Each structure stands twice: as C-alpha cells, then as structure tokens.
Amino acid sequence: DRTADLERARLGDDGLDFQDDAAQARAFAQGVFLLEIPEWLDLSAGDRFARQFFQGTGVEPYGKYRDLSSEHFGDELLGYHSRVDQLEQFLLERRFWGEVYPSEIATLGEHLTLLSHRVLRSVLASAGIPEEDWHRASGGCSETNGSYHLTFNHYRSAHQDIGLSSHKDDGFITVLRTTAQGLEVNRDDVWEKVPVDPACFVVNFGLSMEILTSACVTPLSAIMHRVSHQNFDRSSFGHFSSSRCLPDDGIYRYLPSAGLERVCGSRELIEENDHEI
Ligand SMILES: O=C(O)CCC(=O)C(=O)O
Numbered sequence: 099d100r101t102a103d104l105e106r107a108r109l110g111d112d113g114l115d116f117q118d119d120a121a122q123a124r125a126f127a128q129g130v131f132l133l134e135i136p137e138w139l140d141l142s143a144g145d146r147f148a149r150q151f152f153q154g155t156g157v158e159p160y161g162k163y164r165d166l167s168s169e170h171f172g173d174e175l176l177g178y179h180s181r182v183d184q185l186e187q188f189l190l191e192r193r194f195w196g197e198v199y200p201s202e203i204a205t206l207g208e209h210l211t212l213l214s215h216r217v218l219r220s221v222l223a224s225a226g227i228p229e230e231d232w233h234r235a236s237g238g239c240s241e242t243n244g245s246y247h248l249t250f251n252h253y254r255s256a257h258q259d260i261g262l263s264s265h266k267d268d269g270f271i272t273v274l275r276t277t278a279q280g281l282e283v284n285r286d287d288v289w290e291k292v293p294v295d296p297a298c299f300v301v302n303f304g305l306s307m308e309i310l311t312s313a314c315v316t317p318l319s320a321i322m323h324r325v326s327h328q329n330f331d332r333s334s335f336g337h338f339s340s341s342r343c344l345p346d347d348g349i350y351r352y353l354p355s356a357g358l359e360r361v362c363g364s365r366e367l368i369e370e371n372d373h374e375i
Pocket residue numbers: 249251262267274276280281323324325333334335336
C-alpha cells in the first residue's frame with residue numbers, strides 16, 4: 099500500500115506551528131496531520147485503559163468498564179459497545195468523566211479537551227470566520243462548552259472483519275492516539291497507510307467542520323478513513339469534539355459576509371452519519 103506523507107505541527111505560543119505557512123495550508127487542505135504530543139502529557143494510563151477495558155472485572159484496574167453497557171447511561175451511545183467490525187469500544191461524554199471514569203482518565207480527557215480547543219481555534223482563524231461567531235459556529239468547542247467524547251478502541255483480531263470500516267467522523271475535530279499500524283486514509287481517492295509515530299497524535303476533522311467551512315476560501319473536509327483487518331490485536335483512543343446538545347440549537351454553515359446559516363440539528367447529524375458510514 100501507499101503511505102501518506104503528513105505534515106507535522108506542534109502547539110506553540112500562537113496556536114499551531116507548522117514548518118511554514120505552506121505546510122499549514124497543505125495540512126488543513128488534506129484534512130489530516132500529525133500533532134506533536136507535549137512532553138509533559140502522560141498517556142500511559144490511557145494506553146493501559148485501551149488495552150484493558152474490554153476484559154471484565156477480573157482485570158485490574160480498568161477491565162470492569164466492560165460491564166457498563168449502554169443501559170447504564172440514558173444515552174444509548176455511551177458505555178461499552180461491541181461493533182460489527184473487529185472494533186469494540188468504550189465511549190463516554192465529558193459530563194460523565196468525573197463520576198464514571200477513573201480520576202486519572204478524566205484528567206487525561208480534560209487535558210485533551212484543552213489541547214483540542216487550542217487546535218480548533220487555530221483552524222477557525224485560518225478559515226476567515228469572525229471571532230465573535232466562533233462559539234455558535236463550533237457548538238461551544240471554541241471555548242469549553244462543546245460535547246467531548248473520550249473513546250477507547252480495541253480491535254479483536256479473532257474476528258474476521260475489517261478493523262473499522264470506512265467512515266467520516268462526526269463533530270469538528272478528532273485527536274487520535276495510535277501507536278500501531280492499521281489506520282488508512284483516503285486523501286486523494288487513493289487509500290494510504292498513516293505512518294506510525296507514537297510521539298504524535300493524528301488530527302482530522304469531522305462532518306460538522308466540513309459543513310461549517312464548505313463556503314470558505316479553503317473548504318475543509320472530513321477525511322474518509324478506516325482501520326484495516328488486524329491479524330493481531332490493536333488498541334487506540336481518541337478525543338472527539340462536537341456540538342453541545344442540551345435539551346436549543348444545532349449545526350451551522352458559515353456564509354462569508356453574512357454569518358451563520360443553520361443547516362440541521364445536533365441530533366439529526368450524528369444519527370444519520372451512524373448508518374451509511
Ligand atoms: O483506531 C483508530 O486508529 C481509528 C479509530 C477511529 O477512526 C474512530 O474511532 O472513529
């Protein structure tokens with residue numbers, strides 16, 4: 099297979115620092131890039147959670163999360179889920195982290211939320227959207243008011259599926275921590291392997307970002323991606339930012355010189371992407 103050549107960025111004093119302005123433009127136009135993991139941020143507990151959560155109460159300290167199914171939350175989409183592909187997941191929105199996750203996992207989630215916030219604001223500035231529209235345009239993610247899922251993934255190599263079939267993420271921005279081969283992206287109609295680099299996150303955009311920016315100078319895309327069939331197990335985890343969803347408003351497209359036009363609801367966007375994706 100092809101291997102994607104990705105731009106690398108780091109968080110600095112003025113948001114995202116790519117190598118130069120040209121690289122930033124390639125990165126945002128491709129819809130995927132690498133983000134250097136801050137040296138102070140500890141990912142070891144998250145890594146361990148992704149390796150354990152599916153294993154049940156015999157396995158300490160995280161296997162017990164296997165038992166918190168969807169029926170424990172009111173929200174069908176949270177807790178432990180076996181998927182149709184090799185993937186199984188544990189997903190939790192931020193309003194539940196403090197009560198439900200281990201304290202050190204909630205900490206990791208909070209750090210990733212603030213890191214994702216900085217990345218998103220750097221992207222919004224590059225899109226030419228006026229700053230006073232950012233909070234509504236981002237469904238709260240330009241501050242700390244969005245919906246945030248910290249989601250743990252395990253690929254059951256004993257299952258005869260693709261690892262995770264082709265899809266685009268919901269939401270605005272995904273910060274993905276992966277340390278093993280498997281992720282593939284359809285950059286320019288060709289499937290390419292994402293090179294492994296455990297010192298970087300993989301960052302891409304979701305469908306809400308694509309809708310938002312479709313009329314800008316450089317429309318941004320929610321990149322189609324998948325995880326190939328795994329012959330041996332694999333795990334990963336990701337931080338996913340989407341619009342606030344308190345039972346108000348919904349999903350916007352930015353029109354240069356005019357402001358924000360509502361396209362649909364927060365609800366209808368996720369439930370509709372759940373199927374054909
Ligand atoms: O596990 C991976 O590398 C990708 C996971 C992913 O694409 C997702 O959870 O939406």
